[PDB]
Amino acid sequence: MVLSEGEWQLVLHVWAKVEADVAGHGQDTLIRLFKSHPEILEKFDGLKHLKTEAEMKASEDLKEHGVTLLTALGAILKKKGHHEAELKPLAQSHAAKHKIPIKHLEFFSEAIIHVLHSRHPGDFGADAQGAMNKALELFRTDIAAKYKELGYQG
Ligand code: HEM
């Protein structure tokens, strides 16, 4: 699967809205993800004690995790599929002690898509929704192949 130049443009146009406030988008995304999938919070050794939305919003560690995640994802998206160099260390990091199943990356993808619908509907119409679905699917497909190269089936 590939994305066209037009699909990439839609993806990066809505991503520019995320970049206007990376930390806030990261908090919204992670809080949504952890409420929807408490098992995923267990994969973050330093965050797993957090329970209430106010406590999660107060956590500097959670905020930093959201910035790390979204900054790395933005760099990957701006590679427009030519992301082998970025995905290889990311696969390794996610295949250390806490293996991150592909399904958790899919749940993450659902969370960021929800945040985009909620925050930026004017820049997240039908065509942009389709393109973002495909961009995150491509990321997950290619990560899965890099997992396998390292001996992790995902
Ligand atoms: C459900 C989703 C995810 C979980 C549970 C998760 C979990 C983790 C964990 C446990 C590590 C630590 C490895 C270590 O301790 O050395 C890590 C590292 C990292 N992850 Fe994720 N991750 C997720 C999604 C993502 C995504 C989507 C991205 C970017 C596209 C990302 C970017 C990074 C980066 C850059 C690092 C290395 C920097 C650091 O250690 O803070 N993560 N992740």
PDB file of C-alpha atoms and ligand atoms in Angstrom:
ATOM      1  CA  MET A   1       0.000   0.000   0.000  1.00  0.00           C
ATOM      2  CA  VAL A   2       1.087   3.568  -0.736  1.00  0.00           C
ATOM      3  CA  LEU A   3      -0.392   6.981  -0.147  1.00  0.00           C
ATOM      4  CA  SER A   4      -0.583   9.455  -2.993  1.00  0.00           C
ATOM      5  CA  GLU A   5       0.911  12.923  -2.750  1.00  0.00           C
ATOM      6  CA  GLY A   6      -2.629  14.213  -2.233  1.00  0.00           C
ATOM      7  CA  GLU A   7      -3.264  11.833   0.657  1.00  0.00           C
ATOM      8  CA  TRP A   8       0.031  12.810   2.290  1.00  0.00           C
ATOM      9  CA  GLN A   9      -0.884  16.474   1.936  1.00  0.00           C
ATOM     10  CA  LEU A  10      -4.185  15.881   3.734  1.00  0.00           C
ATOM     11  CA  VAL A  11      -2.352  14.007   6.504  1.00  0.00           C
ATOM     12  CA  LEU A  12       0.268  16.697   6.993  1.00  0.00           C
ATOM     13  CA  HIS A  13      -2.254  19.541   6.825  1.00  0.00           C
ATOM     14  CA  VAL A  14      -4.172  18.142   9.792  1.00  0.00           C
ATOM     15  CA  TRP A  15      -0.904  17.189  11.493  1.00  0.00           C
ATOM     16  CA  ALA A  16       0.121  20.848  11.388  1.00  0.00           C
ATOM     17  CA  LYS A  17      -2.821  21.498  13.725  1.00  0.00           C
ATOM     18  CA  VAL A  18      -1.402  18.924  16.162  1.00  0.00           C
ATOM     19  CA  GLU A  19       1.982  20.664  16.042  1.00  0.00           C
ATOM     20  CA  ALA A  20       0.433  23.934  17.236  1.00  0.00           C
ATOM     21  CA  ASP A  21       0.124  22.272  20.664  1.00  0.00           C
ATOM     22  CA  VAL A  22       1.980  18.987  20.795  1.00  0.00           C
ATOM     23  CA  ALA A  23       1.813  18.650  24.576  1.00  0.00           C
ATOM     24  CA  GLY A  24      -1.939  19.219  24.779  1.00  0.00           C
ATOM     25  CA  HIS A  25      -2.654  16.816  21.925  1.00  0.00           C
ATOM     26  CA  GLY A  26      -0.385  14.248  23.565  1.00  0.00           C
ATOM     27  CA  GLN A  27      -2.218  14.518  26.872  1.00  0.00           C
ATOM     28  CA  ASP A  28      -5.606  14.141  25.189  1.00  0.00           C
ATOM     29  CA  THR A  29      -4.437  11.168  23.124  1.00  0.00           C
ATOM     30  CA  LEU A  30      -2.816   9.275  26.001  1.00  0.00           C
ATOM     31  CA  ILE A  31      -5.666   9.938  28.436  1.00  0.00           C
ATOM     32  CA  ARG A  32      -8.173   8.675  25.853  1.00  0.00           C
ATOM     33  CA  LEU A  33      -5.992   5.634  25.159  1.00  0.00           C
ATOM     34  CA  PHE A  34      -5.532   4.761  28.833  1.00  0.00           C
ATOM     35  CA  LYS A  35      -9.234   5.104  29.633  1.00  0.00           C
ATOM     36  CA  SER A  36     -10.214   2.985  26.616  1.00  0.00           C
ATOM     37  CA  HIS A  37      -7.444   0.408  27.187  1.00  0.00           C
ATOM     38  CA  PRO A  38      -6.184   0.204  30.792  1.00  0.00           C
ATOM     39  CA  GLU A  39      -3.914  -2.666  29.785  1.00  0.00           C
ATOM     40  CA  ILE A  40      -1.836  -0.165  27.784  1.00  0.00           C
ATOM     41  CA  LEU A  41      -1.127   1.987  30.833  1.00  0.00           C
ATOM     42  CA  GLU A  42       0.579  -1.097  32.325  1.00  0.00           C
ATOM     43  CA  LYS A  43       3.219  -0.884  29.577  1.00  0.00           C
ATOM     44  CA  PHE A  44       4.448   2.498  30.926  1.00  0.00           C
ATOM     45  CA  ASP A  45       6.325   1.724  34.146  1.00  0.00           C
ATOM     46  CA  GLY A  46       6.313   5.352  35.290  1.00  0.00           C
ATOM     47  CA  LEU A  47       2.672   6.173  34.489  1.00  0.00           C
ATOM     48  CA  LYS A  48       0.762   3.048  35.555  1.00  0.00           C
ATOM     49  CA  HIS A  49      -0.300   4.386  38.988  1.00  0.00           C
ATOM     50  CA  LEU A  50      -2.318   7.266  37.488  1.00  0.00           C
ATOM     51  CA  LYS A  51      -6.096   6.955  37.756  1.00  0.00           C
ATOM     52  CA  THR A  52      -8.019  10.246  37.536  1.00  0.00           C
ATOM     53  CA  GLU A  53      -8.088  12.626  34.590  1.00  0.00           C
ATOM     54  CA  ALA A  54      -6.932  15.469  36.855  1.00  0.00           C
ATOM     55  CA  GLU A  55      -3.995  13.385  38.074  1.00  0.00           C
ATOM     56  CA  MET A  56      -3.094  12.409  34.500  1.00  0.00           C
ATOM     57  CA  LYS A  57      -3.309  16.050  33.443  1.00  0.00           C
ATOM     58  CA  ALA A  58      -1.027  17.080  36.315  1.00  0.00           C
ATOM     59  CA  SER A  59       1.652  14.512  35.451  1.00  0.00           C
ATOM     60  CA  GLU A  60       4.736  16.041  33.856  1.00  0.00           C
ATOM     61  CA  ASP A  61       5.839  12.494  32.979  1.00  0.00           C
ATOM     62  CA  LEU A  62       2.642  11.776  31.033  1.00  0.00           C
ATOM     63  CA  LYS A  63       2.957  15.100  29.210  1.00  0.00           C
ATOM     64  CA  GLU A  64       6.566  14.302  28.284  1.00  0.00           C
ATOM     65  CA  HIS A  65       5.517  10.849  27.027  1.00  0.00           C
ATOM     66  CA  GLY A  66       2.846  12.439  24.851  1.00  0.00           C
ATOM     67  CA  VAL A  67       5.380  14.878  23.395  1.00  0.00           C
ATOM     68  CA  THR A  68       7.883  12.082  22.728  1.00  0.00           C
ATOM     69  CA  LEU A  69       5.241   9.970  21.005  1.00  0.00           C
ATOM     70  CA  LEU A  70       3.680  12.678  18.848  1.00  0.00           C
ATOM     71  CA  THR A  71       7.011  14.281  17.886  1.00  0.00           C
ATOM     72  CA  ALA A  72       8.345  10.939  16.684  1.00  0.00           C
ATOM     73  CA  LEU A  73       5.100  10.199  14.839  1.00  0.00           C
ATOM     74  CA  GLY A  74       5.171  13.605  13.147  1.00  0.00           C
ATOM     75  CA  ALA A  75       8.716  12.980  11.925  1.00  0.00           C
ATOM     76  CA  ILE A  76       7.588   9.626  10.514  1.00  0.00           C
ATOM     77  CA  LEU A  77       4.536  11.149   8.789  1.00  0.00           C
ATOM     78  CA  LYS A  78       6.703  13.854   7.193  1.00  0.00           C
ATOM     79  CA  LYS A  79       8.790  11.060   5.614  1.00  0.00           C
ATOM     80  CA  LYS A  80       5.643  10.149   3.635  1.00  0.00           C
ATOM     81  CA  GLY A  81       6.303   6.424   3.774  1.00  0.00           C
ATOM     82  CA  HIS A  82      10.099   6.650   3.343  1.00  0.00           C
ATOM     83  CA  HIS A  83      10.538   5.939   7.022  1.00  0.00           C
ATOM     84  CA  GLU A  84      12.719   2.821   7.263  1.00  0.00           C
ATOM     85  CA  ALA A  85      15.412   4.742   9.142  1.00  0.00           C
ATOM     86  CA  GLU A  86      12.883   5.992  11.696  1.00  0.00           C
ATOM     87  CA  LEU A  87      11.001   2.720  12.097  1.00  0.00           C
ATOM     88  CA  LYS A  88      14.019   0.511  12.784  1.00  0.00           C
ATOM     89  CA  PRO A  89      15.003   1.997  16.185  1.00  0.00           C
ATOM     90  CA  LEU A  90      11.331   2.451  17.031  1.00  0.00           C
ATOM     91  CA  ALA A  91      10.698  -1.257  16.469  1.00  0.00           C
ATOM     92  CA  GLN A  92      13.663  -2.120  18.723  1.00  0.00           C
ATOM     93  CA  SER A  93      12.448   0.158  21.537  1.00  0.00           C
ATOM     94  CA  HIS A  94       9.033  -1.415  21.364  1.00  0.00           C
ATOM     95  CA  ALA A  95      10.447  -4.912  21.416  1.00  0.00           C
ATOM     96  CA  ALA A  96      12.575  -4.638  24.564  1.00  0.00           C
ATOM     97  CA  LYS A  97      11.242  -5.680  27.974  1.00  0.00           C
ATOM     98  CA  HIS A  98       7.732  -4.326  27.350  1.00  0.00           C
ATOM     99  CA  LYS A  99       6.832  -5.681  23.927  1.00  0.00           C
ATOM    100  CA  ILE A 100       4.243  -3.438  22.303  1.00  0.00           C
ATOM    101  CA  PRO A 101       1.780  -5.578  20.312  1.00  0.00           C
ATOM    102  CA  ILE A 102       0.669  -4.274  16.933  1.00  0.00           C
ATOM    103  CA  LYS A 103      -2.845  -4.233  18.386  1.00  0.00           C
ATOM    104  CA  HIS A 104      -1.752  -1.632  20.968  1.00  0.00           C
ATOM    105  CA  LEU A 105      -0.491   0.522  18.114  1.00  0.00           C
ATOM    106  CA  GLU A 106      -3.915   0.094  16.517  1.00  0.00           C
ATOM    107  CA  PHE A 107      -5.593   1.243  19.721  1.00  0.00           C
ATOM    108  CA  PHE A 108      -3.225   4.215  19.771  1.00  0.00           C
ATOM    109  CA  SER A 109      -4.224   4.964  16.169  1.00  0.00           C
ATOM    110  CA  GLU A 110      -7.900   4.948  17.172  1.00  0.00           C
ATOM    111  CA  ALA A 111      -7.153   7.372  20.005  1.00  0.00           C
ATOM    112  CA  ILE A 112      -5.329   9.924  17.843  1.00  0.00           C
ATOM    113  CA  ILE A 113      -8.071   9.659  15.208  1.00  0.00           C
ATOM    114  CA  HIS A 114     -10.660  10.395  17.882  1.00  0.00           C
ATOM    115  CA  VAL A 115      -8.634  13.428  18.988  1.00  0.00           C
ATOM    116  CA  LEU A 116      -8.507  14.710  15.411  1.00  0.00           C
ATOM    117  CA  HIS A 117     -12.285  14.327  14.962  1.00  0.00           C
ATOM    118  CA  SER A 118     -12.851  16.047  18.313  1.00  0.00           C
ATOM    119  CA  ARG A 119     -10.430  18.963  17.937  1.00  0.00           C
ATOM    120  CA  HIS A 120     -10.069  19.691  14.200  1.00  0.00           C
ATOM    121  CA  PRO A 121     -13.207  18.652  12.294  1.00  0.00           C
ATOM    122  CA  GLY A 122     -12.804  21.533   9.823  1.00  0.00           C
ATOM    123  CA  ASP A 123      -9.405  20.124   8.782  1.00  0.00           C
ATOM    124  CA  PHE A 124     -10.449  16.488   9.161  1.00  0.00           C
ATOM    125  CA  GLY A 125     -13.135  15.927   6.541  1.00  0.00           C
ATOM    126  CA  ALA A 126     -13.870  12.716   4.669  1.00  0.00           C
ATOM    127  CA  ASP A 127     -10.784  12.718   2.461  1.00  0.00           C
ATOM    128  CA  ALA A 128      -8.428  13.537   5.350  1.00  0.00           C
ATOM    129  CA  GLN A 129     -10.050  10.811   7.486  1.00  0.00           C
ATOM    130  CA  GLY A 130      -9.374   8.234   4.794  1.00  0.00           C
ATOM    131  CA  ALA A 131      -5.808   9.427   4.300  1.00  0.00           C
ATOM    132  CA  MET A 132      -5.004   9.376   8.026  1.00  0.00           C
ATOM    133  CA  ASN A 133      -6.477   5.860   8.328  1.00  0.00           C
ATOM    134  CA  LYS A 134      -4.100   4.766   5.586  1.00  0.00           C
ATOM    135  CA  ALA A 135      -1.052   6.599   6.951  1.00  0.00           C
ATOM    136  CA  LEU A 136      -1.411   4.960  10.352  1.00  0.00           C
ATOM    137  CA  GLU A 137      -2.146   1.576   8.775  1.00  0.00           C
ATOM    138  CA  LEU A 138       1.050   1.894   6.710  1.00  0.00           C
ATOM    139  CA  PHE A 139       3.014   2.750   9.865  1.00  0.00           C
ATOM    140  CA  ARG A 140       1.617  -0.333  11.630  1.00  0.00           C
ATOM    141  CA  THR A 141       2.241  -2.605   8.618  1.00  0.00           C
ATOM    142  CA  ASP A 142       5.850  -1.482   8.303  1.00  0.00           C
ATOM    143  CA  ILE A 143       6.477  -1.665  12.077  1.00  0.00           C
ATOM    144  CA  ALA A 144       5.135  -5.221  12.028  1.00  0.00           C
ATOM    145  CA  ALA A 145       7.736  -6.151   9.390  1.00  0.00           C
ATOM    146  CA  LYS A 146      10.508  -4.548  11.454  1.00  0.00           C
ATOM    147  CA  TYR A 147       9.322  -6.403  14.567  1.00  0.00           C
ATOM    148  CA  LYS A 148       9.635  -9.669  12.659  1.00  0.00           C
ATOM    149  CA  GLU A 149      13.161  -8.836  11.504  1.00  0.00           C
ATOM    150  CA  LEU A 150      14.135  -8.610  15.180  1.00  0.00           C
ATOM    151  CA  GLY A 151      12.416 -11.861  16.171  1.00  0.00           C
ATOM    152  CA  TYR A 152       9.187 -10.369  17.565  1.00  0.00           C
ATOM    153  CA  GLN A 153       5.911 -11.417  15.943  1.00  0.00           C
ATOM    154  CA  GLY A 154       3.990  -8.403  17.296  1.00  0.00           C
TER     155      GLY A 154
HETATM  156  C1  HEM B   1       0.161   1.793  22.633  1.00  0.00           C
HETATM  157  C2  HEM B   1       1.183   2.492  22.140  1.00  0.00           C
HETATM  158  C3  HEM B   1       2.619   2.536  22.722  1.00  0.00           C
HETATM  159  C4  HEM B   1       3.164   1.997  23.824  1.00  0.00           C
HETATM  160  C5  HEM B   1       2.494   1.128  24.913  1.00  0.00           C
HETATM  161  C6  HEM B   1       4.572   2.375  23.850  1.00  0.00           C
HETATM  162  C7  HEM B   1       5.487   2.013  24.812  1.00  0.00           C
HETATM  163  C8  HEM B   1       6.839   2.306  24.807  1.00  0.00           C
HETATM  164  C9  HEM B   1       7.802   1.848  25.781  1.00  0.00           C
HETATM  165  C10 HEM B   1       7.499   0.930  26.985  1.00  0.00           C
HETATM  166  C11 HEM B   1       9.003   2.343  25.461  1.00  0.00           C
HETATM  167  C12 HEM B   1      10.269   2.119  26.313  1.00  0.00           C
HETATM  168  C13 HEM B   1      11.390   1.237  25.815  1.00  0.00           C
HETATM  169  C14 HEM B   1      12.438   1.421  26.892  1.00  0.00           C
HETATM  170  O1  HEM B   1      12.059   1.519  28.091  1.00  0.00           O
HETATM  171  O2  HEM B   1      13.645   1.507  26.562  1.00  0.00           O
HETATM  172  C15 HEM B   1       8.837   3.167  24.275  1.00  0.00           C
HETATM  173  C16 HEM B   1       9.804   3.895  23.616  1.00  0.00           C
HETATM  174  C17 HEM B   1       9.556   4.805  22.613  1.00  0.00           C
HETATM  175  N1  HEM B   1       8.373   4.946  21.912  1.00  0.00           N
HETATM  176 FE1  HEM B   1       6.623   4.053  22.357  1.00  0.00          FE
HETATM  177  N2  HEM B   1       4.834   3.160  22.750  1.00  0.00           N
HETATM  178  C18 HEM B   1       3.666   3.264  22.036  1.00  0.00           C
HETATM  179  C19 HEM B   1       3.525   3.943  20.860  1.00  0.00           C
HETATM  180  C20 HEM B   1       4.465   4.746  20.280  1.00  0.00           C
HETATM  181  C21 HEM B   1       4.326   5.419  19.021  1.00  0.00           C
HETATM  182  C22 HEM B   1       3.057   5.339  18.153  1.00  0.00           C
HETATM  183  C23 HEM B   1       5.451   6.132  18.816  1.00  0.00           C
HETATM  184  C24 HEM B   1       5.853   7.041  17.633  1.00  0.00           C
HETATM  185  C25 HEM B   1       5.374   6.918  16.390  1.00  0.00           C
HETATM  186  C26 HEM B   1       6.339   5.884  19.926  1.00  0.00           C
HETATM  187  C27 HEM B   1       7.598   6.417  20.095  1.00  0.00           C
HETATM  188  C28 HEM B   1       8.534   5.973  20.999  1.00  0.00           C
HETATM  189  C29 HEM B   1       9.879   6.493  21.152  1.00  0.00           C
HETATM  190  C30 HEM B   1      10.484   7.646  20.331  1.00  0.00           C
HETATM  191  C31 HEM B   1      10.485   5.799  22.120  1.00  0.00           C
HETATM  192  C32 HEM B   1      11.933   5.983  22.628  1.00  0.00           C
HETATM  193  C33 HEM B   1      12.077   7.219  23.499  1.00  0.00           C
HETATM  194  C34 HEM B   1      11.718   6.897  24.920  1.00  0.00           C
HETATM  195  O3  HEM B   1      12.197   5.863  25.447  1.00  0.00           O
HETATM  196  O4  HEM B   1      10.945   7.673  25.532  1.00  0.00           O
HETATM  197  N3  HEM B   1       5.712   5.031  20.797  1.00  0.00           N
HETATM  198  N4  HEM B   1       7.503   3.123  23.918  1.00  0.00           N
END
